[PDB]
A paper describes a structure:
B. bacteriovorus is an obligate bacterial predator of other Gram-negative bacteria, exploiting adaptations that allow consumption from inside the prey cell periplasm. The DgcB protein appends the C-terminal GGDEF enzymatic domain with an N-terminal forkhead-associated (FHA) domain, known to be used (in other proteins) for interactions with phosphopeptide ligands. DgcB comprised a ~30aa tail, 100aa FHA, 20aa linker and 160aa GGDEF domain. We provide the molecular basis for initiation of c-di-GMP production, demonstrating that the stimulus is a phosphopeptide tail present on the DgcB GGDEF synthase itself.
To resolve this issue, we obtained 1.87 Å data on a new crystal form (tail-FHA only, lacking the GGDEF domain) comprised of residues 1–135 of DgcB. In this new form, four FHA domains comprise the asymmetric unit, with each monomer arranged at ~90˚ to the neighboring domain. Upon imposing crystal symmetry, it is apparent that each monomer contacts a symmetry-related molecule in precisely the same manner as chains A and B of the full-length DgcB structure (mediated through D56). Hence it can be inferred that the FHA:FHA contacts in full-length DgcB are not dictated by constraints imposed by the GGDEF domain. For one of the FHA domains, difference density was observable at the putative phosphopeptide-binding cleft (next to consensus residues S75, R76 and T96). Our high resolution data allowed us to unambiguously model this density as residues K13-S19 of the previously disordered N-terminal tail of DgcB. It was not possible to assign the tail as originating from a specific chain (chain B, C and D FHA domains are all close enough to span the distance to the bound tail). In agreement with assignment of the FHA domain as a putative phosphothreonine receptor, the interactions between the tail and FHA cleft centre around residue T14, which is conserved in homologues of DgcB. The FHA cleft makes three hydrogen bonds to the tail (involving R61, T96 and N97), which binds in a linear conformation across the apical face of the FHA fold. Aligning the N-terminal tail from a representative group of DgcB homologues reveals a pattern of conservation across a seven residue span (−3 to +3 with respect to the central threonine); our structure underlines the importance of the +3 position (V17), which points downward into the cleft and is a crucial recognition feature of the peptide substrate in other FHA-based sensory systems.
Author numbering: 13 to 19
């Protein structure tokens, strides 16, 4: 699965 970026 794809990482979630920092927001």
């Amino acid at each position: 699965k794809t990482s979630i970026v920092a927001s």
